[PDB]
PDB file of C-alpha atoms in Angstrom:
ATOM      1  CA  UNK A 232      95.934 -85.865 -54.286  1.00 19.81           C
ATOM      2  CA  UNK A 233      96.588 -82.760 -52.056  1.00 16.69           C
ATOM      3  CA  UNK A 234      94.754 -80.174 -49.875  1.00 12.78           C
ATOM      4  CA  UNK A 235      93.241 -78.443 -52.986  1.00 12.01           C
ATOM      5  CA  UNK A 236      91.464 -81.663 -54.105  1.00 14.50           C
ATOM      6  CA  UNK A 237      90.644 -82.377 -50.402  1.00 16.36           C
ATOM      7  CA  UNK A 238      88.617 -79.113 -50.095  1.00 16.22           C
ATOM      8  CA  UNK A 239      87.028 -79.617 -53.597  1.00 12.69           C
ATOM      9  CA  UNK A 240      85.959 -83.213 -52.671  1.00 10.46           C
ATOM     10  CA  UNK A 241      84.424 -82.022 -49.350  1.00 12.79           C
ATOM     11  CA  UNK A 242      82.256 -79.501 -51.290  1.00 14.92           C
ATOM     12  CA  UNK A 243      81.284 -81.981 -54.039  1.00 15.74           C
ATOM     13  CA  UNK A 244      80.315 -84.831 -51.641  1.00 13.07           C
ATOM     14  CA  UNK A 245      77.843 -82.736 -49.546  1.00  9.84           C
ATOM     15  CA  UNK A 246      76.922 -79.561 -51.511  1.00 11.66           C
ATOM     16  CA  UNK A 247      76.213 -80.680 -55.139  1.00 12.82           C
ATOM     17  CA  UNK A 248      73.256 -82.255 -56.991  1.00 11.69           C
ATOM     18  CA  UNK A 249      72.788 -83.143 -60.648  1.00 10.22           C
ATOM     19  CA  UNK A 250      70.321 -80.581 -62.148  1.00 12.20           C
ATOM     20  CA  UNK A 251      68.530 -81.376 -65.472  1.00 14.99           C
ATOM     21  CA  UNK A 252      66.623 -78.689 -67.458  1.00 15.72           C
ATOM     22  CA  UNK A 253      65.476 -78.783 -71.149  1.00 18.68           C
ATOM     23  CA  UNK A 254      68.998 -77.332 -71.963  1.00 20.58           C
ATOM     24  CA  UNK A 255      70.894 -80.381 -70.431  1.00 22.21           C
ATOM     25  CA  UNK A 256      72.527 -81.776 -67.238  1.00 21.56           C
ATOM     26  CA  UNK A 257      74.510 -79.320 -64.994  1.00 16.76           C
ATOM     27  CA  UNK A 258      76.577 -79.523 -61.818  1.00 14.78           C
ATOM     28  CA  UNK A 259      74.461 -77.517 -59.313  1.00  9.74           C
ATOM     29  CA  UNK A 260      76.008 -76.076 -56.081  1.00  8.53           C
ATOM     30  CA  UNK A 261      73.758 -76.044 -52.971  1.00  9.23           C
ATOM     31  CA  UNK A 262      74.691 -73.044 -50.774  1.00  7.65           C
ATOM     32  CA  UNK A 263      72.302 -73.178 -47.709  1.00  5.80           C
ATOM     33  CA  UNK A 264      68.752 -74.359 -46.779  1.00  4.68           C
ATOM     34  CA  UNK A 265      67.056 -75.235 -50.173  1.00  4.88           C
ATOM     35  CA  UNK A 266      68.969 -72.517 -52.135  1.00  2.40           C
ATOM     36  CA  UNK A 267      71.342 -73.516 -54.981  1.00  2.50           C
ATOM     37  CA  UNK A 268      73.033 -71.840 -58.003  1.00  4.25           C
ATOM     38  CA  UNK A 269      73.280 -72.783 -61.710  1.00  5.14           C
ATOM     39  CA  UNK A 270      74.415 -70.922 -64.896  1.00  5.54           C
ATOM     40  CA  UNK A 271      71.588 -68.668 -66.193  1.00  5.26           C
ATOM     41  CA  UNK A 272      71.900 -70.339 -69.674  1.00  6.46           C
ATOM     42  CA  UNK A 273      70.409 -73.551 -68.024  1.00  6.08           C
ATOM     43  CA  UNK A 274      67.032 -71.693 -68.457  1.00  8.77           C
ATOM     44  CA  UNK A 275      65.455 -72.934 -65.177  1.00 10.95           C
ATOM     45  CA  UNK A 276      61.621 -73.173 -65.355  1.00 10.17           C
ATOM     46  CA  UNK A 277      58.773 -74.058 -62.912  1.00 10.97           C
ATOM     47  CA  UNK A 278      59.988 -77.738 -62.712  1.00 10.65           C
ATOM     48  CA  UNK A 279      63.593 -79.079 -62.658  1.00 12.23           C
ATOM     49  CA  UNK A 280      65.019 -82.643 -62.193  1.00 12.65           C
ATOM     50  CA  UNK A 281      67.365 -82.951 -59.115  1.00 14.17           C
ATOM     51  CA  UNK A 282      69.256 -86.322 -59.111  1.00 15.18           C
ATOM     52  CA  UNK A 283      66.527 -87.544 -61.613  1.00 12.86           C
ATOM     53  CA  UNK A 284      63.576 -86.584 -59.303  1.00 10.71           C
ATOM     54  CA  UNK A 285      60.876 -84.127 -60.467  1.00 11.01           C
ATOM     55  CA  UNK A 286      61.210 -81.002 -58.216  1.00  7.77           C
ATOM     56  CA  UNK A 287      59.076 -77.807 -58.092  1.00  6.51           C
ATOM     57  CA  UNK A 288      61.091 -74.555 -58.344  1.00  3.99           C
ATOM     58  CA  UNK A 289      59.809 -72.248 -55.534  1.00  7.35           C
ATOM     59  CA  UNK A 290      61.796 -69.178 -56.778  1.00  5.51           C
ATOM     60  CA  UNK A 291      64.463 -68.442 -59.427  1.00  6.83           C
ATOM     61  CA  UNK A 292      66.365 -65.181 -59.979  1.00  5.03           C
ATOM     62  CA  UNK A 293      68.831 -64.429 -62.819  1.00  6.54           C
ATOM     63  CA  UNK A 294      71.329 -62.049 -61.173  1.00  6.54           C
ATOM     64  CA  UNK A 295      72.464 -58.783 -62.824  1.00  8.50           C
ATOM     65  CA  UNK A 296      74.846 -56.104 -61.473  1.00 11.52           C
ATOM     66  CA  UNK A 297      73.668 -52.531 -60.695  1.00 13.97           C
ATOM     67  CA  UNK A 298      74.728 -51.528 -64.289  1.00 14.77           C
ATOM     68  CA  UNK A 299      71.910 -54.015 -65.366  1.00 13.84           C
ATOM     69  CA  UNK A 300      74.662 -56.295 -66.828  1.00 14.71           C
ATOM     70  CA  UNK A 301      74.264 -60.137 -66.871  1.00 13.29           C
ATOM     71  CA  UNK A 302      76.235 -62.025 -64.097  1.00 12.48           C
ATOM     72  CA  UNK A 303      75.285 -65.521 -65.575  1.00 11.59           C
ATOM     73  CA  UNK A 304      74.288 -66.784 -62.030  1.00 13.13           C
ATOM     74  CA  UNK A 305      70.697 -67.990 -61.359  1.00 10.14           C
ATOM     75  CA  UNK A 306      69.753 -68.495 -57.668  1.00 11.01           C
ATOM     76  CA  UNK A 307      67.167 -71.277 -57.315  1.00 12.20           C
ATOM     77  CA  UNK A 308      65.052 -72.256 -54.297  1.00  9.47           C
ATOM     78  CA  UNK A 309      64.054 -75.967 -54.577  1.00 12.27           C
ATOM     79  CA  UNK A 310      60.907 -77.683 -53.174  1.00 14.02           C
ATOM     80  CA  UNK A 311      63.228 -80.365 -51.672  1.00 15.20           C
ATOM     81  CA  UNK A 312      62.629 -82.269 -48.368  1.00 15.26           C
ATOM     82  CA  UNK A 313      66.261 -81.778 -47.233  1.00 12.34           C
ATOM     83  CA  UNK A 314      68.577 -78.768 -46.572  1.00 12.42           C
ATOM     84  CA  UNK A 315      72.148 -78.274 -47.834  1.00  8.74           C
ATOM     85  CA  UNK A 316      75.016 -77.884 -45.400  1.00 11.80           C
ATOM     86  CA  UNK A 317      75.447 -74.091 -45.014  1.00 11.39           C
ATOM     87  CA  UNK A 318      78.717 -73.167 -46.887  1.00 16.07           C
ATOM     88  CA  UNK A 319      78.151 -69.369 -47.020  1.00 14.00           C
ATOM     89  CA  UNK A 320      81.242 -68.807 -44.750  1.00 16.11           C
ATOM     90  CA  UNK A 321      83.429 -70.236 -47.613  1.00 18.47           C
ATOM     91  CA  UNK A 322      82.267 -67.465 -50.073  1.00 20.12           C
ATOM     92  CA  UNK A 323      84.564 -64.494 -50.776  1.00 19.78           C
ATOM     93  CA  UNK A 324      83.264 -61.033 -49.825  1.00 18.53           C
ATOM     94  CA  UNK A 325      85.113 -59.126 -52.654  1.00 19.37           C
ATOM     95  CA  UNK A 326      86.154 -59.569 -56.342  1.00 21.65           C
ATOM     96  CA  UNK A 327      89.725 -61.044 -56.374  1.00 22.45           C
ATOM     97  CA  UNK A 328      92.388 -63.066 -58.241  1.00 23.72           C
ATOM     98  CA  UNK A 329      93.374 -66.535 -56.858  1.00 25.68           C
ATOM     99  CA  UNK A 330      96.201 -69.076 -57.040  1.00 27.58           C
ATOM    100  CA  UNK A 331      95.929 -72.829 -57.457  1.00 28.55           C
ATOM    101  CA  UNK A 332      92.173 -73.398 -58.099  1.00 30.08           C
ATOM    102  CA  UNK A 333      90.326 -76.721 -58.802  1.00 30.87           C
ATOM    103  CA  UNK A 334      87.261 -77.024 -61.077  1.00 33.22           C
ATOM    104  CA  UNK A 335      85.038 -79.960 -59.904  1.00 35.74           C
ATOM    105  CA  UNK A 336      82.178 -81.502 -61.991  1.00 36.26           C
ATOM    106  CA  UNK A 337      79.666 -84.241 -61.205  1.00 35.35           C
ATOM    107  CA  UNK A 338      77.235 -85.321 -63.974  1.00 31.26           C
ATOM    108  CA  UNK A 339      76.167 -88.638 -65.682  1.00 31.62           C
ATOM    109  CA  UNK A 340      78.790 -87.843 -68.426  1.00 31.33           C
ATOM    110  CA  UNK A 341      81.577 -86.695 -65.979  1.00 28.88           C
ATOM    111  CA  UNK A 342      81.212 -88.251 -62.463  1.00 28.70           C
ATOM    112  CA  UNK A 343      83.868 -87.441 -59.805  1.00 26.63           C
ATOM    113  CA  UNK A 344      85.834 -85.115 -62.168  1.00 28.73           C
ATOM    114  CA  UNK A 345      88.485 -82.748 -60.627  1.00 29.86           C
ATOM    115  CA  UNK A 346      90.677 -80.407 -62.788  1.00 31.83           C
ATOM    116  CA  UNK A 347      93.659 -78.430 -61.383  1.00 28.21           C
ATOM    117  CA  UNK A 348      93.148 -75.223 -63.443  1.00 29.10           C
ATOM    118  CA  UNK A 349      95.949 -73.195 -61.737  1.00 27.70           C
ATOM    119  CA  UNK A 350      96.000 -69.359 -61.518  1.00 26.65           C
ATOM    120  CA  UNK A 351      92.596 -67.544 -61.700  1.00 22.91           C
ATOM    121  CA  UNK A 352      92.445 -63.942 -63.088  1.00 21.60           C
ATOM    122  CA  UNK A 353      89.737 -61.401 -62.191  1.00 24.72           C
ATOM    123  CA  UNK A 354      89.005 -60.950 -65.949  1.00 25.16           C
ATOM    124  CA  UNK A 355      85.877 -58.760 -65.488  1.00 25.46           C
ATOM    125  CA  UNK A 356      84.036 -58.082 -68.762  1.00 25.58           C
ATOM    126  CA  UNK A 357      83.391 -60.982 -71.206  1.00 25.59           C
ATOM    127  CA  UNK A 358      81.148 -61.212 -74.262  1.00 26.06           C
ATOM    128  CA  UNK A 359      79.791 -64.681 -73.313  1.00 27.22           C
ATOM    129  CA  UNK A 360      77.874 -66.333 -76.202  1.00 24.89           C
ATOM    130  CA  UNK A 361      77.052 -62.790 -77.464  1.00 22.92           C
ATOM    131  CA  UNK A 362      75.871 -61.530 -73.988  1.00 24.99           C
ATOM    132  CA  UNK A 363      77.874 -58.763 -72.177  1.00 23.54           C
ATOM    133  CA  UNK A 364      78.750 -60.367 -68.790  1.00 24.88           C
ATOM    134  CA  UNK A 365      80.529 -58.943 -65.687  1.00 25.97           C
ATOM    135  CA  UNK A 366      82.544 -60.459 -62.735  1.00 26.74           C
ATOM    136  CA  UNK A 367      84.168 -63.212 -64.907  1.00 26.48           C
ATOM    137  CA  UNK A 368      87.082 -65.293 -63.554  1.00 26.69           C
ATOM    138  CA  UNK A 369      89.453 -66.804 -66.207  1.00 27.28           C
ATOM    139  CA  UNK A 370      91.791 -69.850 -66.016  1.00 24.79           C
ATOM    140  CA  UNK A 371      94.092 -71.299 -68.715  1.00 25.99           C
ATOM    141  CA  UNK A 372      92.517 -74.762 -69.110  1.00 25.32           C
ATOM    142  CA  UNK A 373      90.772 -76.066 -72.269  1.00 29.45           C
ATOM    143  CA  UNK A 374      87.380 -76.773 -70.617  1.00 31.27           C
ATOM    144  CA  UNK A 375      84.651 -78.547 -72.707  1.00 30.29           C
ATOM    145  CA  UNK A 376      80.868 -78.975 -73.043  1.00 29.02           C
ATOM    146  CA  UNK A 377      79.642 -80.882 -69.946  1.00 28.61           C
ATOM    147  CA  UNK A 378      81.582 -78.713 -67.385  1.00 28.41           C
ATOM    148  CA  UNK A 379      79.046 -75.813 -67.013  1.00 30.26           C
ATOM    149  CA  UNK A 380      77.967 -75.371 -63.372  1.00 31.25           C
ATOM    150  CA  UNK A 381      81.284 -76.932 -62.268  1.00 27.82           C
ATOM    151  CA  UNK A 382      82.456 -75.547 -58.890  1.00 28.17           C
ATOM    152  CA  UNK A 383      85.699 -73.505 -58.748  1.00 26.93           C
ATOM    153  CA  UNK A 384      87.448 -73.697 -55.315  1.00 25.90           C
ATOM    154  CA  UNK A 385      90.716 -72.823 -53.610  1.00 21.74           C
ATOM    155  CA  UNK A 386      91.756 -74.299 -50.237  1.00 21.44           C
ATOM    156  CA  UNK A 387      89.182 -72.682 -47.922  1.00 23.57           C
ATOM    157  CA  UNK A 388      87.070 -70.819 -50.565  1.00 24.29           C
ATOM    158  CA  UNK A 389      84.237 -71.508 -53.068  1.00 23.94           C
ATOM    159  CA  UNK A 390      84.902 -68.715 -55.623  1.00 20.24           C
ATOM    160  CA  UNK A 391      82.725 -69.371 -58.717  1.00 20.68           C
ATOM    161  CA  UNK A 392      80.785 -71.625 -61.111  1.00 21.94           C
ATOM    162  CA  UNK A 393      82.021 -72.548 -64.630  1.00 23.55           C
ATOM    163  CA  UNK A 394      79.926 -70.788 -67.393  1.00 23.96           C
ATOM    164  CA  UNK A 395      81.955 -71.169 -70.644  1.00 25.12           C
ATOM    165  CA  UNK A 396      85.226 -71.377 -72.555  1.00 25.15           C
ATOM    166  CA  UNK A 397      86.940 -70.525 -75.891  1.00 26.26           C
ATOM    167  CA  UNK A 398      88.832 -73.876 -76.363  1.00 24.62           C
ATOM    168  CA  UNK A 399      92.053 -72.563 -74.630  1.00 24.82           C
ATOM    169  CA  UNK A 400      90.617 -70.632 -71.606  1.00 26.85           C
ATOM    170  CA  UNK A 401      87.687 -71.375 -69.231  1.00 28.01           C
ATOM    171  CA  UNK A 402      85.427 -68.760 -67.569  1.00 28.38           C
ATOM    172  CA  UNK A 403      83.549 -68.810 -64.224  1.00 27.38           C
ATOM    173  CA  UNK A 404      80.950 -66.405 -62.745  1.00 27.67           C
ATOM    174  CA  UNK A 405      82.075 -65.109 -59.308  1.00 27.97           C
ATOM    175  CA  UNK A 406      80.218 -66.215 -56.182  1.00 27.16           C
ATOM    176  CA  UNK A 407      80.078 -63.448 -53.545  1.00 28.32           C
ATOM    177  CA  UNK A 408      78.813 -63.741 -49.920  1.00 26.86           C
ATOM    178  CA  UNK A 409      76.482 -60.734 -50.588  1.00 30.97           C
ATOM    179  CA  UNK A 410      74.388 -62.815 -53.097  1.00 30.84           C
ATOM    180  CA  UNK A 411      73.139 -65.153 -50.243  1.00 29.46           C
ATOM    181  CA  UNK A 412      72.321 -62.843 -47.263  1.00 31.03           C
ATOM    182  CA  UNK A 413      68.763 -63.532 -45.849  1.00 29.65           C
TER     183      UNK A 413
END
């Protein structure tokens, strides 16, 4: 409808796949080459389904901060025959608050879904499903089961991936440029 949804759509159409693990279907953001991200609660193994095709996982790393606290981001390298468009220049360098964000989801259940979630707070610490978690972004939208792995954007920036909610608020793990240096 506007430049927010325009930027979100541009990311969804070229930089997302549908990932299936034994824990369900997730929106999965491709970042560069064969490297993507997914919530750590997806429990990625040696094999994953990418758009319903059996795919070997070449590497997977559940990120933690230097306090050894969960970040809820898993970086996955896929044995795929095709690279993602490199979107690392759209990643923030620092932890921040944002205005006017969009959460975008693409699964079998929720194809072509875009949610204007509004103001995003640098919330920080969250007890997420019983697990102490750092670098959490919060937005005041009643997000539901099916939205995990959803991409949070502003005009010009890819800022996080949706990892949970409490029925009134939704929570995203930050994406930082420093996670994807090579």
